[PDB]
Amino acid sequence: PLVSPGIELKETSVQSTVVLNATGRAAIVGKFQWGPAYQVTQITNEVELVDMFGGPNNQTADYFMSAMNFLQYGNDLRTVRVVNREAAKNASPLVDNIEWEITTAGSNYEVGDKITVKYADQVVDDTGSVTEVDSDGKIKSVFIPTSKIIAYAKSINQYPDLGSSWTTTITSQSSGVSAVITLGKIISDSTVLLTEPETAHEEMTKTEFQTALAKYKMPGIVAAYPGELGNQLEIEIVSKAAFDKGEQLTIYPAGGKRASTAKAVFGYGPQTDTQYAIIVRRDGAVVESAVLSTSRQDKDIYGNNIFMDDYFSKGSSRYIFATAQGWPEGFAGVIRLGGGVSANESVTAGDLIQGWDLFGDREALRVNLLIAGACAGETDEIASTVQKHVSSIADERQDCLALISPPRSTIVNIPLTRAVDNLIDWRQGEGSYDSANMNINTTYAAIDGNYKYQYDKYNDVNRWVPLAADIAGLCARTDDIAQPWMSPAGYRRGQILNCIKLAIEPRQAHRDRMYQAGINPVTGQGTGDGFILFGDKTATTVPTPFDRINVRRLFNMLKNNIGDSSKWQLFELNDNFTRSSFRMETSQYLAGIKALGGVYDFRVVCDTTNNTPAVIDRNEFVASFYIKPARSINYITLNFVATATGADFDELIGP
């Protein structure tokens, strides 16, 4: 920060935030503004999210707010970001250059000879230069400070593509034949999508992109992830030749000349000819510095590798990615990256479907709760087709619980008498919802029944958020207060934390109508600023023992423990010891649940009465658990009887 040790005192505005740190794990997919794409990641607090995936904005807030809410109750949020492959692009060095083309090579020109730029024969700039020649003095390379040209094309309403009159007269103290250059487009569009450092090399090194880099003599640096934040990044590359001489650096592509700070940011220069020091900064502030080498092997002081293609591909960086494969010799220019774009508004069913499938494996990831939920920010048919598919992941895995939400269109600012009718009609697939329907019948899904209004402290705005994340929050943080067979509903538990209001409040006559459709009602508390989840039902319409959420989460807790203990009996013999071992251990486990009160009673059946030799001879082993889960109070009936004076209780009641 300083170079000397010391105390630095500063004043700003900045969003340092504390964390509640109770245990709990859930999974989510969304359209964030920055960070890795189609790669699973682990987020564990508010600030890891903000740094790894970036802050919320208009098009993305539903996913961010959903993630940030769950992350206030739990502590692991296994997260995936998706982007539209045809539309997203990484910020790149080529953007806002002008496509120059050689039209007459000239003769006897030399390096530093002036490039004029004219439109309508008015001079716009002439501070550009010839930057490489052959021994004949023919032009081979030029540089033009495009910022001045842009000041014209942005005010003439021409910026995206230039007119016919743009002309380039090369004028100098010696020429043999007058050279001519032609100007085409300003390249505002960007050349590459790069998602996952492990895969990066080929996508950074196809000949088409590399040709453009070699033509402008630019280094092969790009923004590390597809997004908009990349347009903020500025990179101050330097080499021995520039560093020791303390020279003025050149700024690309905009133009301009600046003093280096590299000798202040490090303690020392890059040490040898083949090494380039990189500094990257954003909004003026430094974010990463490195000393890297283009030698096919090279070592830093400790003995770790610093070859260009390694340092990035091993996963060290989260601002820039680079390659040695076409690096310009001796280069010491400041680069500003441009033309990065996320294309989040283009995201389609195929994206979120392909994203959610990364959680499809029953083995690789023990995640209790699939949040879904944020997808209910979209249009009705996206919200339907994605959420139905996510419930099918719970049907394939058979180990977890998936949340579900009605989309924004269904409730937010529709009158109550209509809003509840729309919500039932959406649930059972009639009216205008007959294409965007729900029809899910699985016991592994829980439909949420309201939308919330909440303060976004990063933008400082109120915004509507799909409620599913907070319900996942309850189902998680219950586990650190009372055991998994305890319901998330109630008043001693089930407080929704941070809210201003919900989109509707269901009056009793409506609340009954929703609950028989299997939608869980979420309501205001009996007074004040509390809000509570007020019921349990999984999404089943057929009757079944696994109807209530607490029973579902109990059998998940058992299946996910006994389904681990039993793994230790794979590739054993089905002898008497294996049977007694598995009977004693799982009985010891269930006796714990019986004592804590999850089940009234249980039996473990596992012996010759079902492991008959007709099972043995096909390499199979069998056991049966008979389990009667706990009841619960749901309906409380209080009678007040307003009896007369006289007529005493020793006669009517008789103590």
Add this chain to the structure above:
Amino acid sequence: GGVYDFRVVCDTTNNTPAVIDRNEFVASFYIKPARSINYITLNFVATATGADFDELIGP
């Protein structure tokens, strides 16, 4: 415990003189190798309150 049982067969019942006269010797090992568990099936049955195990299972 590698094999449940085995037999070694090696006598006049196969080393007949018609084998001897061609400089040959014969023996047969009959070996039944161990099985293994490969497929584990666990049944969870979510029975009602009441309906007790002394009636359904009968210890």
Add this chain to the structure above:
Amino acid sequence: PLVSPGIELKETSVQSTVVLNATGRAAIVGKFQWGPAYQVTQITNEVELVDMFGGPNNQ
């Protein structure tokens, strides 16, 4: 069950039953719903009976 090795978890309703296994031998004839006819057979527990001769019904 599967084709691959693995754990299969399932929910049903099924009448797995324990056995008291004290010694004793007796003989009986009857009109069961399934299994061999006019042939003597040996039954030794509840489940061998249910599998070999089938469950009870009205007749």
Add this chain to the structure above:
Amino acid sequence: RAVDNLIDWRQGEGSYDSANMNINTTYAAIDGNYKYQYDKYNDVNRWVPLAADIAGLCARTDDIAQPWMSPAGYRRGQILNCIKLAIEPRQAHRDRMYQAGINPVTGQGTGDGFILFGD
């Protein structure tokens, strides 16, 4: 696509009809995944064919439990040093591979374990 390519390579169809497998011997065991690993000499991550670790299991079993014990399981068959495998076969795919005689190698039920999951 990856699982389909792998079966097609195993039984010699599609673009693999020249580069085929057709081996039918009981003296061979086909491995079914590729691993990503840290090379401590170059200090890089690189992809490695998994066969060496499977040979490792089939060897070091002999100093833990006798040779008729399977290399597969969870009490044995831990693959030691890994970052990730090239694919994880979901159940519907895992069945399709195993009937082609390819041994599935997978992540453990949680965490940083990986196990050889069939013979």
Add this chain to the structure above:
Amino acid sequence: TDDIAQPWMSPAGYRRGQILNCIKLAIEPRQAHRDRMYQAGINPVTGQGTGDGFILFGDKTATTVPTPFDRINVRRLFNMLKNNIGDSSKWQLFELNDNFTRSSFRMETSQYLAGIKALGGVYDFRVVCDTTNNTPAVIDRNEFVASFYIKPARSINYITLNFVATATGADFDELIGP
């Protein structure tokens, strides 16, 4: 320092590094100058924040090339180790390079470094000394080898304090959320 806190502790600071008897120093380096000196590897010595104190205000050895042994505390730590293990090892001159000599030198120096690990000079250490480097091609030339892998302690050097002058209203339960 060696009689107040162990040799891996820096001589700089304010809880230590008081220069005792002085009237004045020949210059006082203002911040813009203090940076320029420190990148040249000169250690700045300054007045205390007030009064009659003076303090040594930085660590750098005279190196210009980068190296792990840059800061004075790291240098004095590796001196303390080299000057102890380089004495313990003397007792193995003119021994045999047999299995007992190796186990002896591994156990004793591990016991020593475990003391440094507990007092907090190093986060962790490994001692490597066996057939993986004392191969017979070393034995036959009357040589013995051992390798110590040591990760020395970090230190605070730069403290950044942010004061944010927020409005009335606009409360901390909304902005910070305890």
Add this chain to the structure above:
Amino acid sequence: KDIYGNNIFMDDYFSKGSSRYIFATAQGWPEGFAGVIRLGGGVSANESVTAGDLIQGWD
């Protein structure tokens, strides 16, 4: 952002509920404008209030 770091974009400042005299939007704002405005033609129509209003209110 204003000096403290609170938001001052037009459509936010009003919609978050700060004002109780005027509401505004950026969505069609004239460039550089510096005119004094006097608002007009506001009307409550209180005398027109009908059963449907008070019924909808009380609910």
Add this chain to the structure above:
Amino acid sequence: ELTDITRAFESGDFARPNLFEVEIPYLGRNFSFKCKAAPMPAGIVEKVPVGYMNRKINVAGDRTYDDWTVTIYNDDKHEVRKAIIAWQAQAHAQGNDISGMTPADYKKVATVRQFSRDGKTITNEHTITGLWPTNVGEVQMDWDSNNEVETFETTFAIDWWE
């Protein structure tokens, strides 16, 4: 029904009366490793009797706090004992001076923690506000007192704990 006692330890165990540490920022890290014993504080709210007819009913009086007394191992160069007395010397000067600093100077914050039986994890943590050492105990040195390490009691006053 004997398994019912497991409800007494849903959290995973009974708390243990020895898995604790005391932190006092004024005294550096090393004090936390030298503090042998410390009572996790009492909370006292003395009752008031209100008489009616010939019976009495109780109502809540006004909260008070007792002193907090720890016990310390002492090292061969008295790095704790000299520091505790040099702290007390700010409350009222030891020796021939007649002086003592303002309460804002000699008051300090302190923290008591109890760990889980996994030594990584803190499960309860109370801050104690406004310590100062009212009494630094004697060390009863004696030529017959062989085969013990030196320990002394210290009695801090406190303003409250949370």
Add this chain to the structure above:
Amino acid sequence: ELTDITRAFESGDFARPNLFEVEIPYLGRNFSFKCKAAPMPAGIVEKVPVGYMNRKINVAGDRTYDDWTVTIYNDDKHEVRKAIIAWQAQAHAQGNDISGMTPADYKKVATVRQFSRDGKTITNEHTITGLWPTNVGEVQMDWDSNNEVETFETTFAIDWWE
């Protein structure tokens, strides 16, 4: 079924209570050939009873260690016995001095090994951390005690073993 006992020795044999050696680096090679007997250490974790109603259930208490006692053959020039006492002399000076070094100086590491019945191969090896000799035994010399070699017991304290 009597062959089943072979499962008790899959490893190739029973362990033998005499195929062992003790190494103590402080004392050179020759100590390992002079140490006659040594118990491979106990591991003690004393139970705590928790009462409920009128029954008690047990929970794990806190680990402790007993002393480690070896027995030594002594040679004609007492190269061991003089060394053990000269080690103890660092813990507290024998004779007319009243002195003793810091714990970092007089503590030492030691190792116990048990061999396979192939004498080349080590099958179990425990390090013992922080030995020092709390008691060097008497030698009961006597003109009637003919036809024995001289032996004595020594009782080391230990901090832990692994």
